[PDB]
Write a protein that binds this ligand. Sequence first.
Ligand SMILES: *[C@@H]1O[C@H](CO)[C@@H](O)[C@H](O)[C@H]1NC(C)=O
Ligand SMILES: *[C@@H]1O[C@H](CO)[C@@H](O)[C@H](O)[C@H]1NC(C)=O
Ligand SMILES: *[C@@H]1O[C@H](CO)[C@@H](O)[C@H](O)[C@H]1NC(C)=O
Lengths: 50, 37
Amino acid sequence: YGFGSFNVSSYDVVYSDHCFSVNSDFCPCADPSVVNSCVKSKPLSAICPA
Amino acid sequence: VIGDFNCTNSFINDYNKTIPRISEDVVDVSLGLGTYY
Ligand SMILES: *[C@@H]1O[C@H](CO)[C@@H](O)[C@H](O)[C@H]1NC(C)=O
Ligand SMILES: *[C@@H]1O[C@H](CO)[C@@H](O)[C@H](O)[C@H]1NC(C)=O
Ligand SMILES: *[C@@H]1O[C@H](CO)[C@@H](O)[C@H](O)[C@H]1NC(C)=O
């Protein structure tokens, strides 16, 4: 789901602080066809994989 | 489904509801089945 690179200086190492595991059917986008009646809290959307 | 690369679409009977009977059996370990060295 779109991780390109670490764009930092080439002598600094990266380390995380939280690991979030998800299930095998994850997608961070909402369904766009079920948003056409909402006014408040309209999220960005796309077409998730099958 | 399994993956998300559409390989082909020939002869895909996607009009059904019947999840078929699979089978059942009982695992019997009395003679060595299910063990390893
Ligand atoms: C890497 O690129 C992003 C966007 O192009 C920018 O925000 C960031 O400051 C860059 N990092 C460095 C170390 O140049
Ligand atoms: C899957 O691929 C075949 C051949 O490339 C095409 O005819 C079919 O429409 C595709 N299915 C979808 C859902 O795009
Ligand atoms: C379900 O599959 C059977 C054969 O496996 C077929 O005879 C039946 O018509 C199918 N049901 C539907 C609703 O198409």
